[PDB]
Ligand binder design. Structure first.
Ligand SMILES: NCCCCCN(O)C(=O)CCC(=O)NS(=O)(=O)OC[C@H]1O[C@@H](n2cnc3c(N)ncnc32)[C@H](O)[C@@H]1O
Ligand SMILES: NCCCCCN(O)C(=O)CCC(=O)NS(=O)(=O)OC[C@H]1O[C@@H](n2cnc3c(N)ncnc32)[C@H](O)[C@@H]1O
Ligand SMILES: [Mg+2]
Ligand SMILES: [Mg+2]
Lengths: 592, 593
């Protein structure tokens, strides 16, 4: 409410800590992407230095170098020097001084600085939260972990901008604040809107289950009072931010003409997940997630949702689900997906006429419902986002460290269970089906029992999967997920997304934490890779064609994508084109 | 603040239909005026014209009365839309899509322009829910009832009331037609980044104590002391709540966190947004200054922030022009005054300066100025109104100019003469005797009324708008930047375009339709007032012949074409003559007369 309370989290001490942490990450991850090469130090062994565009400002730091060109920069070691004088660490100055070394055009730079300022504000807010250990997050439970995550995506520096949120909207809607949100419900006329049902879904029963017979009837009452037949309308849940700031103005014609009718708030209370636009039902955890369209800029993309793509989303989930159920190799890993079960899209005829297929004006009003992983739990089982494995608390304990400890297992035995539940299905998906995911910490959930990973749950399916075989035999609703990927890039779905974008941080984390040395981590990864491959000699050709044990693989840079284009990191027509490969990495599996 | 359903209650099928007919009516009228299309008579029926879509398959048929300066009085009730032989609904969005190439809307601008149209229509829908007030009713309600009772906005621009950036709740809070009180947000800005510029006679410490009262000033100092800070190191900047909550608190979060900016809280006084949206009248204490704020919202061809750099020169330019009017008996005899911009504050964001060019909107996000109120100078029986009221037509067909003429008891030409001497003649003298042009449209001009008659004009929005069209003219240093090189054949368009084609065209047409004053009598009176001025100053006969206001024709300077070409920056500020779009000529009504 208060003017002064809304920015109270922005204090000099928290701002200083946020800037140190962000610059540390910038030094580490821009080094990794070879945007700059830290020259060895003036005499000191682990010391390094990086210089501004003009050479006159120097950032000196210490760093432990680790596998996959990992740089763990010590935050407390960083110093900013100019003319022999120390200057305060400032992320904004850093990016301006390096504007040309990084590919930051004159057009992108001020927006990127906003994303940086916004990320730093988020860190300040997170610093005001009660301190919680890895043990406390686990004892807190599923949403305690979800809203307790602090880092966000570990590669991207400008990863938590949420551009579009005012400070009051940040407090209301950001996942790390965990404030309950009531979704806005609209009635959408069937001439413009369409509901697509997964197998076994019926619109009428679906909306009764999810809203309650009482609310459906109240909504039908509001429509009939306006002279509208409820049989002409479909329900669409919308994010409050999207309604107040976008739909009520941009779609004012549709509202005024009663193609859209605002019904009011949901009775249930929802919690934003790490993707921001996707909500978990806190009142009834068994009910579906709701994924909304949110025309906010975060980490390289506007986070709307395509009305057109909703038509085939549940069919792609029904197909993948049956594929897993009918493959004993996947069924034995325990893999499951939480299916996208129903979807609604609104086709704005006029904005479609005025734009092209790639326009964000076509991604402003749509929603899908996704199964909750809670009812499937057995006695003693619990859920965590895979992103928790690389979350480190204020005592230096990662949540993976705490799990290993509580499990009583040797680290490699614990790591083997995790890899069998999470990594093995990726190998089988790749080699037996040309199938790839986007399996980062936010798209993966882990089922825990006795501290041990029992199985993995994948989500965000229809927007993310790809069958890397244009001639692949699929049912028609699914064929749009095929794509031509160059041969020497197909295996990057493992090399980049798993090894260099997640395992790199998990292995380095567990080593610094004195839980598991790097070599023992990557040996376990090799052992699990061989445990799969030796079980299926019929695929030996493909194991040779796509060598996970090759000496090197390509360095596929992630921040460079956002630096080149922070509105749309990859073209969705040709996503392989946007990749920026910059030399090679030594593969840890080689020789193993 | 309010209900989900209440906030969009004004958007109903009936009001949306009415708003769309009104907007298409204006689009047909003003685009025909700018020759974006040339309406052809349909089937020969006298009065019936037709305008077709890009492909020619859709027809917009309508009737219109044509008047001076290629003015098209399109009848809103007459418009029909026809394609494939069947009537279609009047939809402003489909109209612009169907005519996208004819109007020159690129693929990049069209979807944003549609947003501006949709928002302008939503505003018309809100205004259609308000209690209906007559021209007499508005005059009886007074200065702010007239300000917030205006409905048209700029009379040429079709997408004139976009305010893109307002959500529907922020529209209801902040739009001037809603007249809802606003409390400004106050920031303390560190004096290493912020400057306070005082006009002649202003002292910072006394100025902020007049405007806020000692009690609030001491409270704000207490906020700083509570944070361990020295009030002596800071100055006060008022900001628009929208700007604070949506932009400054995020974009300037580094400045807030480091206590270069400190959020102090809210003003006690209640402010009312004027027609410029970003400038506030003090409802609680009308004698106090207007406050003009930076508001990074897109409206009618420009983002409406306020440059901090330009604040250092702003009071000085007003002090210069105020003295210039006091020391000129031609202007003193017309009664002309300005409400001076008396004080200004700018915040220099060092990092965004380093990261942008001079003309970046990131340098226009934090700045304010205080402008004199025109109220305490009023004598017994005097009232204020925006000049926009003259072309405001109520629901009964009566303009406020109509009601004023009636109430005055004078003959329309005599009423008009009083108006012309207060408002128009000072522009003539300014151009001829000083090479000085304004932006003197309805929103930048206030009229003082007594017994129904214009007593004198008040000009505002000075530092940002005036131009001295003489690079070699002698001026004090802070004023020299308003000098500019304007082509010879264009210097007079500051009268022809800004006065005749963009305001008198509507006022003369309105009074003619209202059956109050015929066009010929209107323009004859203007001609007569022009000769009265010229014959009284023969020492300027050279310039009078050099810039012939009685030429047979002058350039058609098109306004909507500017916003259709670039709807974020209609003109470049370094070279504003370059952006103009001249399309043929107009028959000057003063030619015969
Ligand atoms: N073939 C892939 C090669 C890499 C190309 C780069 N690229 O397009 C991506 O990395 C996609 C990133 C992405 O947007 N994934 S998403 O669609 O599933 O969105 C995830 C959202 O959640 C946020 N977020 C918060 N916390 C995390 C963590 N811990 N990991 C990942 N993402 C997180 C993201 O910012 C995003 O908004
Ligand atoms: N010699 C000049 C040739 C014409 C160049 C075209 N051009 O740049 C303009 O017309 C700019 C007009 C302008 O923005 N004037 S402003 O800076 O004072 O903006 C005024 C604001 O008030 C709004 N508004 C509401 N109602 C009116 C009326 N009746 N007249 C004018 N303006 C009005 C405007 O939309 C704007 O936001
Ligand atoms: Mg996701
Ligand atoms: Mg103005």
């Amino acid at each position: 409410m208060s003017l002064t309370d809304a920015v109270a989290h922005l204090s000099p001490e928290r701002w200083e800590e946020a800037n140190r942490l962000l610059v540390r990450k910038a030094l580490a991850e821009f080094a990794h992407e070879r945007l700059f090469t830290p020259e060895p130090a003036d005499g000191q062994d682990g010391r390094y230095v990086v210089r501004s565009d003009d050479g006159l400002t120097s950032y000196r730091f210490t760093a432990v170098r680790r596998a996959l060109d990992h740089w763990q920069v010590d935050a407390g070691s960083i110093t900013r020097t100019r003319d022999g004088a120390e200057l305060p660490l400032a992320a904004l100055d850093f990016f301006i001084e390096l504007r040309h070394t990084l590919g930051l055009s004159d057009e992108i730079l001020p927006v990127y600085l906003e994303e940086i300022s916004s990320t730093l504000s988020g860190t300040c807010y997170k610093l005001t939260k009660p301190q919680v250990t890895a043990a406390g997050l686990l004892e807190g439970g599923f949403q305690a972990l979800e809203s307790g995550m602090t880092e966000g995506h570990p590669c991207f520096v400008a990863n938590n901008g949420r551009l579009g949120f005012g400070v009051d909207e940040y407090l209301a809607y950001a996942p790390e604040t965990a404030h309950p949100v009531r979704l806005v419900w609209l009635a959408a006329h069937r001439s413009r809107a369409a509901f697509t049902a997964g197998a076994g879904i019926d619109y009428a029963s679906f909306v009764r289950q999810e809203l309650g017979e009482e609310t459906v009837e109240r909504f039908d009452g509001v429509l009939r009072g306006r002279g509208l037949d409820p049989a002409d309308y479909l329900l669409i849940p919308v994010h409050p931010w999207q309604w107040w700031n976008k739909l009520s103005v941009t779609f004012a014609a549709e509202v005024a003409r009663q193609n859209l009718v605002c019904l009011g708030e949901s009775d249930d209370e929802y919690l934003a997940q790490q993707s921001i636009r996707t909500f978990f039902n806190a009142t009834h955890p068994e009910k579906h997630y709701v994924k909304t369209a949110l025309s906010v800029l975060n980490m390289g993309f506007m986070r709307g949702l395509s009305a057109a793509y909703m038509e085939a989303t549940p069919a792609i989930n029904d197909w993948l689900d049956r594929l897993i159920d009918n493959d004993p190799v996947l069924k034995s890993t325990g893999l499951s997906i939480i299916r996208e079960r129903a979807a609604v899209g609104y086709r704005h005829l006029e904005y479609e006429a005025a734009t092209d297929r790639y326009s964000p004006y076509r991604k402003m009003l749509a929603a899908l419902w996704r199964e909750s992983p809670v009812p499937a739990l057995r006695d003693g089982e619990s859920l965590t986002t895979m992103a928790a494995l690389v979350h480190v608390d204020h005592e230096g304990r990662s949540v993976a460290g705490e799990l290993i400890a509580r499990s009583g297992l040797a680290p490699t035995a614990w790591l083997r269970h995790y890899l069998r539940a999470y990594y093995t299905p990726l190998l089988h998906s790749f080699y037996a089906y040309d199938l790839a995911f986007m399996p980062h910490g936010e798209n993966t959930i882990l089922v825990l029992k006795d501290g041990v990973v029992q199985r993995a749950v994948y989500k965000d399916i229809a927007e993310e999967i790809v069958v890397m075989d244009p001639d692949a035999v699929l049912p028609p609703e699914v064929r749009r997920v095929r794509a031509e990927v160059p041969e020497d890039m197909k295996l990057l779905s493992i090399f980049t997304d798993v090894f260099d974008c997640f395992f790199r941080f998990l292995a380095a984390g567990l080593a610094t934490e004195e839980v598991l040395a790097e070599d023992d981590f990557w040996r376990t990864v090799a052992e699990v890779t061989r445990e799969y491959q030796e079980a299926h000699p019929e695929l030996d050709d493909r194991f040779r064609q796509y060598d996970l044990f090759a000496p090197e693989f390509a360095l596929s840079c992630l921040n460079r994508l956002q630096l080149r284009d922070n509105r749309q990191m990859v073209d969705l027509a040709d996503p392989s084109a946007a990749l920026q490969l910059v030399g090679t990495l030594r593969n840890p599996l080689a020789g193993l």
